[PDB]
Amino acid sequence: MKRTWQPNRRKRAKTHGFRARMRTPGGRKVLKRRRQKGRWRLTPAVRKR
Amino acid sequence: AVKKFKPYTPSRRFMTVADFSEITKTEPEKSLVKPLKKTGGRNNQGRITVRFRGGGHKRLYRIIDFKRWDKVGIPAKVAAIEYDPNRSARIALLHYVDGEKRYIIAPDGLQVGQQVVAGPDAPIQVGNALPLRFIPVGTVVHAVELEPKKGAKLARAAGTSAQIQGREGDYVILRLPSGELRKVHGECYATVGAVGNADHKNIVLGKAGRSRWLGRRPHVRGAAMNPVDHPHGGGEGRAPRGRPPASPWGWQTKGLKTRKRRKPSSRFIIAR
RNA sequence: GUGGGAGAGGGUGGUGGAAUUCCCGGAGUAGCGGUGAAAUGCGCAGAUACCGGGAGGAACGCCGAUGGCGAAGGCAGCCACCUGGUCCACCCGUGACGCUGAGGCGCGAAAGCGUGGGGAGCAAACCGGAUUAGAUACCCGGGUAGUCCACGCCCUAAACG
RNA sequence: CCGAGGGUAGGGCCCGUGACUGGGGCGAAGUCGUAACAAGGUAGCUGUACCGGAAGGUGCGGCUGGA
RNA sequence: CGCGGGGUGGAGCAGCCUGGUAGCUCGUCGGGCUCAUAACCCGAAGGUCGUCGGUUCAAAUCCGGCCCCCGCAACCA
RNA sequence: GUGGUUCGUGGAGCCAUGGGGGAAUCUGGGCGGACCACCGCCUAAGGCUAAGUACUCCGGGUGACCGAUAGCGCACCAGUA
RNA sequence: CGAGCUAGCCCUGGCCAGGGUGAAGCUGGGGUGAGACCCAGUGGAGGCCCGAACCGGUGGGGGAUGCAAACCCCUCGGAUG
RNA sequence: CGAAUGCCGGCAUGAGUAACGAUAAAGAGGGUGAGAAUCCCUCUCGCCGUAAGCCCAAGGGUUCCUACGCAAUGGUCGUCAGCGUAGGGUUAGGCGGGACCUAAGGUGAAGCCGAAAGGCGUAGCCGAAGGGCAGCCGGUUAAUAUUCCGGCCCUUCCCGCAGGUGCGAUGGGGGGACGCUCUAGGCUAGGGGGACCGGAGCCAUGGACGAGCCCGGCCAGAAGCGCAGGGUGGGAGGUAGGCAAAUCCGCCUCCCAACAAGCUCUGCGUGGUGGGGAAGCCCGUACGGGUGACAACCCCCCGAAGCCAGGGAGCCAAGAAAAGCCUCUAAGCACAACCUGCGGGAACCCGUACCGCAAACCGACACAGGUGGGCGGGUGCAAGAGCACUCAGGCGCGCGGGAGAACCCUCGCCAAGGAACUCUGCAAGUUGGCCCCGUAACUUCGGGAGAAGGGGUGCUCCCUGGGGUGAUGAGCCCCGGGGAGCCGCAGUGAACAGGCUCUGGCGACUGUUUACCAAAAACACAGCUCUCUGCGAACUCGUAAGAGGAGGUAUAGGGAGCGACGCUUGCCCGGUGCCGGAAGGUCAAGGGGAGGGGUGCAAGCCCCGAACCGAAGCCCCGGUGAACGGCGGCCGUAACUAUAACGGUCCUAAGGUAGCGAAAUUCCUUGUCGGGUAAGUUCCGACCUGCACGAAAAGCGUAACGACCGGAGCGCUGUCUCGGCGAGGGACCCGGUGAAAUUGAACUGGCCGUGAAGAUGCGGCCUACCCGUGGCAGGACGAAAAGACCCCGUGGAGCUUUACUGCAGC
RNA sequence: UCGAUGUCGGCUCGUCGCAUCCUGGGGCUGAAGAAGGUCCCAAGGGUUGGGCUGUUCGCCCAUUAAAGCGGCACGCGAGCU
Ligand SMILES: NC[C@@H]1O[C@H](O[C@H]2[C@@H](O)[C@H](O[C@@H]3[C@@H](O)[C@H](N)C[C@H](N)[C@H]3O[C@H]3O[C@H](CO)[C@@H](O)[C@H](O)[C@H]3N)O[C@@H]2CO)[C@H](N)[C@@H](O)[C@@H]1O
Ligand SMILES: [Mg+2]
Ligand SMILES: [Mg+2]
Ligand SMILES: [Mg+2]
Ligand SMILES: [Mg+2]
Ligand SMILES: [Mg+2]
Ligand SMILES: [Mg+2]
Ligand SMILES: [Mg+2]
Ligand SMILES: [Mg+2]
Ligand SMILES: [Mg+2]
Ligand SMILES: [Mg+2]
Ligand SMILES: [Mg+2]
Ligand SMILES: [Mg+2]
Ligand SMILES: [Mg+2]
Ligand SMILES: [Mg+2]
Ligand SMILES: [Mg+2]
Ligand SMILES: [Mg+2]
Ligand SMILES: [Mg+2]
Ligand SMILES: [Mg+2]
Ligand SMILES: [Mg+2]
Ligand SMILES: [Mg+2]
Ligand SMILES: [Mg+2]
Ligand SMILES: [Mg+2]
Ligand SMILES: [Mg+2]
Ligand SMILES: [Mg+2]
Ligand SMILES: [Mg+2]
Ligand SMILES: [Mg+2]
Ligand SMILES: [Mg+2]
Ligand SMILES: [Mg+2]
Ligand SMILES: [Mg+2]
Ligand SMILES: [Mg+2]
Ligand SMILES: [Mg+2]
Ligand SMILES: [Mg+2]
Ligand SMILES: [Mg+2]
Ligand SMILES: [Mg+2]
Ligand SMILES: [Mg+2]
Ligand SMILES: [Mg+2]
Ligand SMILES: [Mg+2]
Ligand SMILES: [Mg+2]
Ligand SMILES: [Mg+2]
Ligand SMILES: [Mg+2]
Ligand SMILES: [Mg+2]
Ligand SMILES: [Mg+2]
Ligand SMILES: [Mg+2]
Ligand SMILES: [Mg+2]
Ligand SMILES: [Mg+2]
Ligand SMILES: [Mg+2]
Ligand SMILES: [Mg+2]
Ligand SMILES: [Mg+2]
Ligand SMILES: [Mg+2]
Numbered sequence A: 001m002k003r004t005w006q007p008n009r010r011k012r013a014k015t016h017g018f019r020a021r022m023r024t025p026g027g028r029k030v031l032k033r034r035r036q037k038g039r040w041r042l043t044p045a046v047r048k049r
Numbered sequence B: 001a002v003k004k005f006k007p008y009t010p011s012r013r014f015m016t017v018a019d020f021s022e023i024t025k026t027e028p029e030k031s032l033v034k035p036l037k038k039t040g041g042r043n044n045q046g047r048i049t050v051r052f053r054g055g056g057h058k059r060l061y062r063i064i065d066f067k068r069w070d071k072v073g074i075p076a077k078v079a080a081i082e083y084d085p086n087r088s089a090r091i092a093l094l095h096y097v098d099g100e101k102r103y104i105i106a107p108d109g110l111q112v113g114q115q116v117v118a119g120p121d122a123p124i125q126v127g128n129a130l131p132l133r134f135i136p137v138g139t140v141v142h143a144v145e146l147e148p149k150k151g152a153k154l155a156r157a158a159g160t161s162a163q164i165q166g167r168e169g170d171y172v173i174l175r176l177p178s179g180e181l182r183k184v185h186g187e188c189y190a191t192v193g194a195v196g197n198a199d200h201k202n203i204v205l206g207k208a209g210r211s212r213w214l215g216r217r218p219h220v221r222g223a224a225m226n227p228v229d230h231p232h233g234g235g236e237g238r239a240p241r242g243r244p245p246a247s248p249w250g251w252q253t254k255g256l257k258t259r260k261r262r263k264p265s266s267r268f269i270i271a272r
Numbered sequence C: 001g002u003g004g005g006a007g008a009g010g011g012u013g014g015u016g017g018a019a020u021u022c023c024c025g026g027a028g029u030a031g032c033g034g035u036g037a038a039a040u041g042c043g044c045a046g047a048u049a050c051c052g053g054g055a056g057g058a059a060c061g062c063c064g065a066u067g068g069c070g071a072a073g074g075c076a077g078c079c080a081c082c083u084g085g086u087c088c089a090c091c092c093g094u095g096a097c098g099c100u101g102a103g104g105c106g107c108g109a110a111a112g113c114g115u116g117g118g119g120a121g122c123a124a125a126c127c128g129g130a131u132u133a134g135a136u137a138c139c140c141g142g143g144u145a146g147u148c149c150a151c152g153c154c155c156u157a158a159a160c161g
Numbered sequence D: 001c002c003g004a005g006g007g008u009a010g011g012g013c014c015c016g017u018g019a020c021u022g023g024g025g026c027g028a029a030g031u032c033g034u035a036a037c038a039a040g041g042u043a044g045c046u047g048u049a050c051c052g053g054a055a056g057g058u059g060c061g062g063c064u065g066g067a
Numbered sequence E: 001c002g003c004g005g006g007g008u009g010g011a012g013c014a015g016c017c018u019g020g021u022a023g024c025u026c027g028u029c030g031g032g033c034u035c036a037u038a039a040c041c042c043g044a045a046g047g048u049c050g051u052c053g054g055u056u057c058a059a060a061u062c063c064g065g066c067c068c069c070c071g072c073a074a075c076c077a
Numbered sequence F: 001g002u003g004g005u006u007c008g009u010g011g012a013g014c015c016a017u018g019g020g021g022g023a024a025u026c027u028g029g030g031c032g033g034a035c036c037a038c039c040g041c042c043u044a045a046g047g048c049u050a051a052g053u054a055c056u057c058c059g060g061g062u063g064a065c066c067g068a069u070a071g072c073g074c075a076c077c078a079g080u081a
Numbered sequence G: 001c002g003a004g005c006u007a008g009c010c011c012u013g014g015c016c017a018g019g020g021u022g023a024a025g026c027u028g029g030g031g032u033g034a035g036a037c038c039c040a041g042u043g044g045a046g047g048c049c050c051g052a053a054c055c056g057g058u059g060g061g062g063g064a065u066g067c068a069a070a071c072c073c074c075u076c077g078g079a080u081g
Numbered sequence H: 001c002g003a004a005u006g007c008c009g010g011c012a013u014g015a016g017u018a019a020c021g022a023u024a025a026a027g028a029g030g031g032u033g034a035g036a037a038u039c040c041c042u043c044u045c046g047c048c049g050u051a052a053g054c055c056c057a058a059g060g061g062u063u064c065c066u067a068c069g070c071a072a073u074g075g076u077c078g079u080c081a082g083c084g085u086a087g088g089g090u091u092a093g094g095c096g097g098g099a100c101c102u103a104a105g106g107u108g109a110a111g112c113c114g115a116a117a118g119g120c121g122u123a124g125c126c127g128a129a130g131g132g133c134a135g136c137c138g139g140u141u142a143a144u145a146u147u148c149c150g151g152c153c154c155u156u157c158c159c160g161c162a163g164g165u166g167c168g169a170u171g172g173g174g175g176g177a178c179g180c181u182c183u184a185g186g187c188u189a190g191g192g193g194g195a196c197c198g199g200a201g202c203c204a205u206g207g208a209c210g211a212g213c214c215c216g217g218c219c220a221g222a223a224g225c226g227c228a229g230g231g232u233g234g235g236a237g238g239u240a241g242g243c244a245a246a247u248c249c250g251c252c253u254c255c256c257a258a259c260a261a262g263c264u265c266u267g268c269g270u271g272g273u274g275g276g277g278a279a280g281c282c283c284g285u286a287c288g289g290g291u292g293a294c295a296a297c298c299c300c301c302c303g304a305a306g307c308c309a310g311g312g313a314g315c316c317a318a319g320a321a322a323a324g325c326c327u328c329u330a331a332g333c334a335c336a337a338c339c340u341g342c343g344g345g346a347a348c349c350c351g352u353a354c355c356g357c358a359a360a361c362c363g364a365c366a367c368a369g370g371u372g373g374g375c376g377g378g379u380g381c382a383a384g385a386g387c388a389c390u391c392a393g394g395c396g397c398g399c400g401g402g403a404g405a406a407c408c409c410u411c412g413c414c415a416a417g418g419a420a421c422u423c424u425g426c427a428a429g430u431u432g433g434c435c436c437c438g439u440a441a442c443u444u445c446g447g448g449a450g451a452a453g454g455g456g457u458g459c460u461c462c463c464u465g466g467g468g469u470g471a472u473g474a475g476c477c478c479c480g481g482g483g484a485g486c487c488g489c490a491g492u493g494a495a496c497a498g499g500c501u502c503u504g505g506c507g508a509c510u511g512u513u514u515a516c517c518a519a520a521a522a523c524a525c526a527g528c529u530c531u532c533u534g535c536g537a538a539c540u541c542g543u544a545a546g547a548g549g550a551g552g553u554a555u556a557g558g559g560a561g562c563g564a565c566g567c568u569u570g571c572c573c574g575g576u577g578c579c580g581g582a583a584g585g586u587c588a589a590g591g592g593g594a595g596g597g598g599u600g601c602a603a604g605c606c607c608c609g610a611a612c613c614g615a616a617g618c619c620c621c622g623g624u625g626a627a628c629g630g631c632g633g634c635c636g637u638a639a640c641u642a643u644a645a646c647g648g649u650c651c652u653a654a655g656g657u658a659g660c661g662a663a664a665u666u667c668c669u670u671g672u673c674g675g676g677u678a679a680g681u682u683c684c685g686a687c688c689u690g691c692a693c694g695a696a697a698a699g700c701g702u703a704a705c706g707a708c709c710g711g712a713g714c715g716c717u718g719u720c721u722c723g724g725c726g727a728g729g730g731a732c733c734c735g736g737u738g739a740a741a742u743u744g745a746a747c748u749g750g751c752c753g754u755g756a757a758g759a760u761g762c763g764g765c766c767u768a769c770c771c772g773u774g775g776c777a778g779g780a781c782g783a784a785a786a787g788a789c790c791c792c793g794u795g796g797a798g799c800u801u802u803a804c805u806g807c808a809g810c
Numbered sequence I: 001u002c003g004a005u006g007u008c009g010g011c012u013c014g015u016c017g018c019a020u021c022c023u024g025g026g027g028c029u030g031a032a033g034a035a036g037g038u039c040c041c042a043a044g045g046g047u048u049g050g051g052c053u054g055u056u057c058g059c060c061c062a063u064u065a066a067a068g069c070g071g072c073a074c075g076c077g078a079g080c081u
């Protein structure tokens, strides 16, 4: 039947986006750590135009 | 009135509709004086505070005039009488001679063509509005104010009305659609007559949908759910509450009074 | 036809005071209530009795009658509107247009019923108190529908002269 | 084609029968109480309404076939 | 089988738990009123207290053994 | 009414303080574990101050530390696939 | 950290083949004092009917290291709300 | 280190075993090639065809095209590919999105709140498949085209000249601007026919040179007409309203029209012109190109759900916003500015490849699954997006070859019987569309109803009534009627297409739910009652602000229960709850100091502390049951027995009423009578001795309705007696690829014993050459899951309450 | 035996014991004969279809020579239900 992953570019940047994470105190920390851990990608790689 | 139906479908037998004869060939509302976008929504910021709402026909707000000392002395002619989805009372639209249009909740009687007005002057006739003092003790009246300049608030439901009782200082005793004798200030307007369309209390919704149309989702009894989400809940085949009847949140609901005790509004009240 | 007569005939609208019950204020105490007698009941939390104010519902005292009105049921404070039957005088108009009347049809007390409004008094059911062998009764104290209004039903009667 | 009659399907009236059940009539001396006829010891009778072992009681209106 | 409740004049109930004292309503018997019966009035009678044991000076009453009676439990499989 | 100190309301001070009350300028004030007298000690309601102390992303040195299943998760284009 | 599954609501758009049934209402006819009302014709109502898409998921069989961590065949519910 | 269902790594066992992923289907010829069932081409066959075809959106991100290539990826092969390597390929003022607008929502100056983080938030900003905005048809590449070329046609902008006008706002007013169902008129899309026109071509096999077969007979298109249609009255005075000002709008009054006459604005024809243009035939593809060709390019009929569109009518549940747009004036400006022409110049940023019901997206997979909008031809069946075949177009599902066992799956049929099957007619059958006769109880008058039960259905010929389009006609297309006759076993001849009834339980009804074992009698539902709430309402979320409630106001909103409707819902307020009690009793902090203590020489300073004053709550006084609930026991009596209307008596707060009652409630229990049956632990009707019904945790009924649950009969049947045969997919054998759970090691028989009491393994005896393949499931206490039951642990959670103790709240 | 020995019934398949239901022998019989009663010998084979119940068992219904009773993990769920 229908599954749980229904990709959607908008929803994805809108939710796990970078400006998205900067906006909140908890998300900014999410960035810190990922930066502090090394992670090549701080946030998901949404795309297209 | 109240239209009836032959049983050509169970439900549309007991079903009963209103009679919109009193509706002056109007229907399409009046831009300008209303309508405004009406933000429908069953909960506040986030959560749902009143339960069981949502869904139900889209609606446009008819921005009515609920404080008439706006036009003291300026007479206006009642133009139409139309339907208002936001209330039980039908409403009358009227053109002042000032050239301004505005709606008023329509009183029983008031016919299209009639002239109506407000102010200390104003003749005591259906439609006219005046400060409570200047109104004849005993006359009935609707659309009362509670405090001078704050707008109408009592007897505005379909065909409801309040009767003046006496005077007493800068105050005048009323008798609200509920039976409470209240002391209102003299300077509160109150347009004379009863609200009209009193057949409203007689409409037999009819089916399940009918309720759904007016935006009210099904209502489930506490008795149906479990202990986790309401007092009356569980365990076997039905069961007699098992304690003093209570609400989802738990306070008694078969008798417990609510008005907050030490309210300042107490002293101006006298009844039930 | 013409000109008059009495009437609680009928419908809507409006209104008057008396009484009642209830609330508030007052003053006032030690009992009121009820009965054949009592008790139940009510009452120092302050009754009953009396004054003052207000609320509300119903029913209209004397007039009033062994009276009037109506086809019956029935109809009663008072004001108006809308309206029905009927009596008289005049003998002027039509000119036999009449009597009854299966059916249909309407009207039809009280009780009851439907939806809604109203609720003071009273009052089936009901609860208590006495009476009683026993009382599901006649007496008493509480009391619900109902009694009241609107529309719709009901159609019965010792609807009896 | 018509057609006696037969077959299948469903109806209309009628009669018989049916555990059980509703009142009813009749049946010399059983139980319970007082409803009625004398003001029947609560005038009765009454249409209706509810209640009660039972007569019956009670509200409401009514009638004299009562004061 | 198990839990606890109960056997009292003819009927239905008290009386114990703080042992010595059996009480109430009806019914039954005798007498009255009535023509007579009921009602009502006046008096009177009737109880090995389920039984076999002992506990104490003394048991309806305290304690164990059985005879019926009533109610409650007989769950997980 | 509470927190701090070893102090859990204890004879409960001292130090901070939300609430109510509400002084004084040396013959003034707080303290020395309820209190009071004595004897003393210090001078609240403003602020600044290196140093000796902590840490080790980073540089260097040394190891009765590991030696590729160990040693960092990664000796290797690993916070990757 | 999650409402890209799911639940509910808010905003803005889309979809529902074809056939049944025939409400009110109008029109006329009868009918009365005027009514009620009875007829036709018209009309096109409805959590109305048969039934696709579409939404379900009733019974049975299959499948059970499957085609599939919910599927397949037959059958069946709804389908202008 | 041998153990931890240990950790990691490797290799074994099962096994050449199961499998190789839809029963839509394959055969051959010729190529290419180291190597062909698997690649290319041709012929024949099969499958889809409201898709298995094509157009979009999403998502994916090079998968597109072309060259060379098969190591690996492909469930086999591979010369092939979505795979490897290389290079190439995606063109825009007009399609989409941005230099336009607003929706919910997001953000947020101001303001408010919060220990901090942060929460709120009218202005504005942000936010789109919604509003607005200018491209149609053809030609080209191996791959792009509403993009490039071609032909016609638009749009803003800036600068000019020519001419008009009070010009001018982020501001005023207009409009934009709206539901649902049903719809008319006239068009277009698309489609059927043509004796007419255009075409290579063809007489086959008995007949046909025929008004024969086969093929095709359009597409875009400015202005102007034309046919449809959508919008809109023109004046002139008065003005105190549209938070300034308006000449605008609005309202009042006097005129002239009420018409669309007139102005507009779309659509559709037609239009200068511009294109396109089959079958066949010839070739060479991996494909497309020539010719057919000066191709014709005409006439009917069907006809939308699409266009005219802001059309109409009906209804109730009463149906976004803002810009652009027109108009209005203000500040300013009127040498500006703006409008109409006409020239010339400027017109930016991003998407375009390809897959797109799928081998390219979501499911670890080249997965029988999920996936949103448009088109979706023909015929036939009553209609249709249905069904059967077929256009176009795309496919034969990336293992094959044989065999013809049992057994399984899917399918077909059957003598006689037909439900004897079984927990149950579970399953399968019969029934089946439309037309016409014809239909009971009951009923809330609609329904029950497709009730039941019947008959008709094909084709040919004759006669004959109505429409539509054309003219009042032929034709083409629609509905009909009557009458003769024909062929089969059979005419909705295949495909799609209810078995019927009788009677109980429950629920009134449509609905809803345990995604992934329960779809129900459960939830919901209209409706009935209680109750809270006077509005800064109650209530809910929040520390607050704040909001919701509600831009509501008692005819309304919250909570509770019952659950259409019919007829009804009885008694008890003792206990608990809630409601009413300016008495009294109790009642903390606080007031108050009687009186007492500690130090002081002391004045003083520090404590204890009784009177009495002291809230709510509790107590007590009252009511309240559609509030929490409760609604008895034992003895006796009627003139046959019986039985008890009657009576006695004990304790209640009162002491179950009507109605129903072997029940979804009945233990004893197949209670006992009656009915159905040859027979009835069920079923239906009764009786009542109701373990243990009973009135809004409703009672008793109820027409209609249900994939709900029980009984019965008819019909039909492979359910059964009782099987049998046939079919295809596997199973079997051959070729290719090649798993798995399990596994202390194994050289693993039977019996009677024995053993921790169920032995291949120990004892005795019996049997028994070694190793396989198709099968069966009796055993290995077989596999699977550290039993889900039970107990244990002073283990853990969810739930409850007059358990304790706190807390929010009041 | 709880690091699992799946459990009532039925169905399919059976096998065994005899303390035998039938049939076959036999002794006594209060056994005339026919039919029986009873014990003894003896399992070789046979041991029906139904209605009710989940049912085991019963109860019936129509027959029968008879309508036997038990074990095999209340035999048999890696065989079904
Ligand atoms: N025929 C009388 C009708 O039935 C009823 O009456 C019947 C009964 O009430 C009545 O019973 C009576 C009883 O009332 C009275 N107080 C005592 C008497 N012994 C009984 O008598 C009855 O039984 C006996 C013996 O069997 C018979 O012989 C006698 O005929 C019969 N009446 O007997 C009557 C039948 O005979 C109605 N009450 C009466 O109004 C009505 O008219
Ligand atoms: Mg938020
Ligand atoms: Mg509910
Ligand atoms: Mg539940
Ligand atoms: Mg709870
Ligand atoms: Mg409960
Ligand atoms: Mg229960
Ligand atoms: Mg004369
Ligand atoms: Mg007459
Ligand atoms: Mg009456
Ligand atoms: Mg009433
Ligand atoms: Mg009263
Ligand atoms: Mg009274
Ligand atoms: Mg009385
Ligand atoms: Mg007496
Ligand atoms: Mg009457
Ligand atoms: Mg009668
Ligand atoms: Mg009379
Ligand atoms: Mg009979
Ligand atoms: Mg009969
Ligand atoms: Mg009889
Ligand atoms: Mg008497
Ligand atoms: Mg009497
Ligand atoms: Mg009578
Ligand atoms: Mg009475
Ligand atoms: Mg501390
Ligand atoms: Mg101090
Ligand atoms: Mg010190
Ligand atoms: Mg010091
Ligand atoms: Mg410092
Ligand atoms: Mg390592
Ligand atoms: Mg590592
Ligand atoms: Mg009609
Ligand atoms: Mg319809
Ligand atoms: Mg429907
Ligand atoms: Mg359907
Ligand atoms: Mg070891
Ligand atoms: Mg094997
Ligand atoms: Mg094999
Ligand atoms: Mg195989
Ligand atoms: Mg690539
Ligand atoms: Mg390719
Ligand atoms: Mg390969
Ligand atoms: Mg594969
Ligand atoms: Mg090659
Ligand atoms: Mg914006
Ligand atoms: Mg947009
Ligand atoms: Mg565009
Ligand atoms: Mg392409
Ligand atoms: Mg201007």
Ligand SMILES: [Mg+2]
Pocket: none
């Ligand atoms: Mg403007």
Ligand SMILES: [Mg+2]
Pocket: none
């Ligand atoms: Mg504007």
Ligand SMILES: [Mg+2]
Pocket: H205
């Ligand atoms: Mg030939």
Ligand SMILES: [Mg+2]
Pocket: none
């Ligand atoms: Mg051909």
Ligand SMILES: [Mg+2]
Pocket: H221
């Ligand atoms: Mg053209």
Ligand SMILES: [Mg+2]
Pocket: H311
């Ligand atoms: Mg319209």
Ligand SMILES: [Mg+2]
Pocket: none
């Ligand atoms: Mg607007």
Ligand SMILES: [Mg+2]
Pocket: none
């Ligand atoms: Mg804007």
Ligand SMILES: [Mg+2]
Pocket: H349
């Ligand atoms: Mg730019």
Ligand SMILES: [Mg+2]
Pocket: H352
């Ligand atoms: Mg492109």
Ligand SMILES: [Mg+2]
Pocket: none
């Ligand atoms: Mg493309």
Ligand SMILES: [Mg+2]
Pocket: H366
């Ligand atoms: Mg594949």
Ligand SMILES: [Mg+2]
Pocket: none
């Ligand atoms: Mg879909």
Ligand SMILES: [Mg+2]
Pocket: none
């Ligand atoms: Mg189509």
Ligand SMILES: [Mg+2]
Pocket: none
């Ligand atoms: Mg199809």
Ligand SMILES: [Mg+2]
Pocket: H414
């Ligand atoms: Mg057969």
